């Protein structure tokens, strides 16, 4: 709900450029074996867009800070401020797992502790990328890690563009304030609470819900704590970003062929995805030869975790 016209104009701006890039490509993507005029052009627009997005991101970030602060003011005006500072304190501590910085901890507190990004309909690639960078290492070298590295490496924009424009609203909706999920204020969500929250985000299947819960609770205690919550949430932002990274057409849903590329494109060993075809089926519950974000996320899990 960031209804600020100066942002909106930068967005429409970046989009005109990108629509160009696409055209050019498609063209050189259709000319025949005789000769690098387009490629020359294409490479151009790529830098341009890469530059427009970089400014747009910053603008989005400032807007976010403006919101968070305003949110703090509100809290205080509604109760013991000092108290509230301790709550955020106890929580951010659970993060202490990666080598987070003071800067990294604020991105995280804003994304998952605030309510500044949640729902705004905007998202910053820069904030994500910075944090992803440090969590990839926390991940055992493997398929899953190549998926993280793929979003971070952000080549030729694409990741940058999809996050800032393509699917910002949807990435903003997968994020939420732990404290708002955590009603009794125990500092650890429960299966009940977990399910409830993830039904709102679209995971209406127990089977998948359990899959997620299983993934977040590394401490094997059948309870989700801020820290594990943050780990699951950063995982969902990546898969949602890759999901859209593989939608050649605007089909809205991925195809067996489409999921194949990404996995390949991500540099994942065939030795790590041999049953891939049967799994695709198992996940296809409706058997429509095309996966949805919820299914794509059950697939990734089924396969690599």
Curated annotation (Swiss-Prot):
One of its GO terms (molecular function) is calcium ion binding. Disulfide bonds: none annotated. Ca(2+) 4 binds at residues 284, 286, 288, 290, 295. This is Plasmodial-specific protein LAV1-2. Pfam families: EF-hand_5. Residues 103-138, 169-204, 234-269, 271-305 form the EF-hand domain. SMART domains: EFh (SM00054). It comes from the Eukaryota. SUPFAM superfamilies: EF-hand. InterPro entries: EF-hand-dom_pair, EF_Hand_1_Ca_BS, EF_hand_dom. Ca(2+) 2 binds at residues 217, 219, 221, 223, 228. Ca(2+) 3 binds at residues 247, 249, 251, 253, 258. Ca(2+) 1 binds at residues 182, 184, 186, 188, 193. PANTHER family: PROTEIN PHOSPATASE 3 REGULATORY SUBUNIT B ALPHA ISOFORM TYPE 1. This protein has four EF-hand homolog domains inferred to bind calcium. It comes from Physarum polycephalum.
